[PDB]
Amino acid sequence: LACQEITVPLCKGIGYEYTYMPNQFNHDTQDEAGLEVHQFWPLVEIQCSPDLKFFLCSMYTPICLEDYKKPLPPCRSVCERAKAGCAPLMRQYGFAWPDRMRCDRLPEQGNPDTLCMDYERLEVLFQG
Numbered sequence: 001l002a003c004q005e006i007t008v009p010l011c012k013g014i015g016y017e018y019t020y021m022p023n024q025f026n027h028d029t030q031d032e033a034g035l036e037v038h039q040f041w042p043l044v045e046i047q048c049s050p051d052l053k054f055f056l057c058s059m060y061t062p063i064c065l066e067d068y069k070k071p072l073p074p075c076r077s078v079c080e081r082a083k084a085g086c087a088p089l090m091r092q093y094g095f096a097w098p099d100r101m102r103c104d105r106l107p108e109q110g111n112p113d114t115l116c117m118d119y120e121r122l123e124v125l126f127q128g
């Protein structure tokens with residue numbers, strides 16, 4: 001609802017400055033979100049996907065903008081790239097791709113009414 005400076009260490013400097021609560025992971029605060037997203041640090045560090053960190057942050061500390069007041073998700077493609085790189089390694093060690101991160105419930109780019117986010121390199125790109 002109101003924008004707050006991102007305070008999750010993993011997500012600081014990710015390409016956007018502000019987040020909001022609640023997220024879609026049943027977190028009311030960044031402290032709660034930070035405790036869950038920190039558990040992914042080994043996968044971030046092993047670099048199974050250059051997109052994993054941006055994807056994680058875009059979900060757990062979603063972007064907050066002053067001039068767009070609708071939830072703004074990562075585009076489905078960001079999720080698909082992160083999943084393609086990292087889900088096989090995750091399965092090998094007994095971890096499923098989390099249901100809340102199912103890429104098919106994220107919107108595709110080009111939507112007439114709403115936006116979604118990708119990035120280049122780190123600069124956010126809105127593609128809608």
Ligand SMILES: NC(=O)N1c2ccccc2C=Cc2ccccc21
Nearest residue numbers: 024058059062071072073105106107
């Ligand atoms: N909070 C939301 O409604 N969205 C949306 C919005 C439109 C479509 C799917 C989704 C799914 C989850 C999600 C994740 C991050 C940021 C926003 C967000």
